[PDB]
Amino acid sequence: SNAAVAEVVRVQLDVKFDFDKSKVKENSYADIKNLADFMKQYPSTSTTVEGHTDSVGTDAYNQKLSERRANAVRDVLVNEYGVEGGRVNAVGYGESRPVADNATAEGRAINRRVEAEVEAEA
Ligand SMILES: C[C@@H](NC(=O)[C@H](CCC[C@@H](N)C(=O)O)NC(=O)O)C(=O)O
Ligand SMILES: [Cl-]
């Protein structure tokens, strides 16, 4: 084993979605642009846009919904803000990775989400 140290700058994005919707809400465009700003300034970086659902419905339905959400955020980054599409990787995890309790409406809302991050040397 060996010791390690590193210093990086990191932008982390969390976009929430309405029930059974993959539309990016208007109040999230500015947040998404912050991630685009970062990628423009560090051209060697890329990002994986990760979609999720709450647990209402089948695993298979939610796998596809999670992928539609990730692609909707990717479309904003690429089409609206001009990040090269090869630098933005859209994937979905369906309902399999909750960060809140699916037993409550509030927890389900938190789970209906896309997360993305970018890091670069600092
Ligand atoms: C009652 C509502 N039920 C549904 O199962 C779904 C979507 C669930 C989506 C959810 N997991 C999310 O993360 O948003 N809608 C559908 O089956 O087409 C309904 O059917 O009205
Ligand atoms: Cl770079």
From Swiss-Prot:
Processing after translation: Might contain two disulfide bonds.
The protein's name in its UniProt record: Outer membrane porin F
Family: Belongs to the outer membrane OOP (TC 1.B.6) superfamily.
Boundaries of every OmpA-like domain copy: 4-122
UniProt domain comment: The N-terminal beta-barrel domain (residues 25-184) when reconstituted into lipid vesicles is blocked at both ends.
Protein species of origin: Pseudomonas aeruginosa (strain ATCC 15692 / DSM 22644 / CIP 104116 / JCM 14847 / LMG 12228 / 1C / PRS 101 / PAO1)
Compartment list: Cell outer membrane
Taxonomic path: Bacteria, Pseudomonadati, Pseudomonadota, Gammaproteobacteria, Pseudomonadales
Function statement: Has porin activity, forming small water-filled channels. Also has a structural role in determining cell shape and ability to grow in low-osmolarity medium.
